[model samples]
Target: AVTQSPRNKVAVTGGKVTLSCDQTNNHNNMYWYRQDTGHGLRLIHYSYGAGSTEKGDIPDGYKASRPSQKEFSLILELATPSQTSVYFCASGGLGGDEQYFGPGTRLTVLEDLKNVFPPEVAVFEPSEAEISHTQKATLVCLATGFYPDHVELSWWVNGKEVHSGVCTDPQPLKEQPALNDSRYALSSRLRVSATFWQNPRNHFRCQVQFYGLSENDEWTQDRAKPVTQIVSAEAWGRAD
Candidate 1:
């Protein structure tokens, strides 16, 4: 009777803390969690008494379930955390003896890990275009060669940043996924006119922010250039 519940109290600054759990009853349901500053007791992981686990979107850390009815245990794997308030244990699920936590376990760990690392943005390139075509002068920003797949991208014209979704919504190009390789790719497109290249500072750049653990967040920035040789007047202009 589970697989969908999330509480907002995630650990973000201490070492590795994994509060454990197990369904003591022969019943078929369980709940596991933690607590802090204002949100009160938070849910970390839960299951319908089957050997499975799911995640809750806590700020910096994530989730895992260790089995139950079965022994449904709560598992938290990574992050830099500094404090924890209490431990809780409960029993009975679905129409019988609800709101019962029998025991509490305080869990902590020693080591360095995300078990994963901060994502690195290694590719931020723009390519020239040939007109076939919808908008003649379209440039593309590609942010790839990164990990953990957490990032944001933006465009700039001669120094002024383009609004992503304001007065008009920011229509970022569709992203191409590279999941299996522990990698991700993103695209931001820019369309310009023949006059765009005429500026002394006919420049453009893409900014990528890979938000990882706070202690290791990364940002990579670079610019893109204009293309040439569009013989079609519908999209060509160079050298007067």
Candidate 2:
């Protein structure tokens, strides 16, 4: 049994999207799920090894998050019509785990045909973040000077996409028409550690992908300059 959406859902496009299912158990590992009348429980992603996000059966254009022992969630920095599916989650049994499987729900993401101005993206402090500070480490990704207020954010460490940490759920944004560039300002927070920033060479990157009223979906990326002698962090650039 798992804790999931009690009914169908309405998702957003060109914005932060999180498709999370709950594992109502002390299960060893957690997973993200979706149910289609035809496909049954389709594995979209999984979490393991403490906040580690692992790709699922058909992992694509999405990321995974295992925030803690009792939960796991799936994040879609950019949502499109193709991802039109109801999301559910699971964990446990065999060193394994079931219980109150919650009610099911459908997710229908609607798109706004409004205008989206030029986009802007930035990194607040790429070079350093005070060590653990009692818990985990992190960096910031900022997206501003844009339109529609719906934007998706992603993080890259040592070069490759990093999803083991927070890839925040798309927040509800109200329309803004009285700002500079006539745009709304938004910021995305990322989770990275001291180990993630041992060197400037570990080059961190931030990419904001937005689906605008008149543009195709593409990520606007900004890479942090390794002020310190560059280090690849040993091919962290490699996608696992």
What's the TM-score of each model vs. the native? Answer: 0.36, 0.41
Best model per TM-score: 2
lDDT of each: 0.44, 0.56
For candidate 2, write residues 1-240 as lDDT tens digits. 566643433345777676556665666677676776678887777765456777789788688877777666667788776676666665665454342344554554546423345355666553332553533446666565555444557676655777786566466233355632245656666666566554445666776665442223333436321111111112222111
Q: Candidate 2, which segments miss by more than 4 Å at Cα?
A: 5-7, 97-102, 113-240
List per-candidate RMSD values in Å: 15.3, 15.7
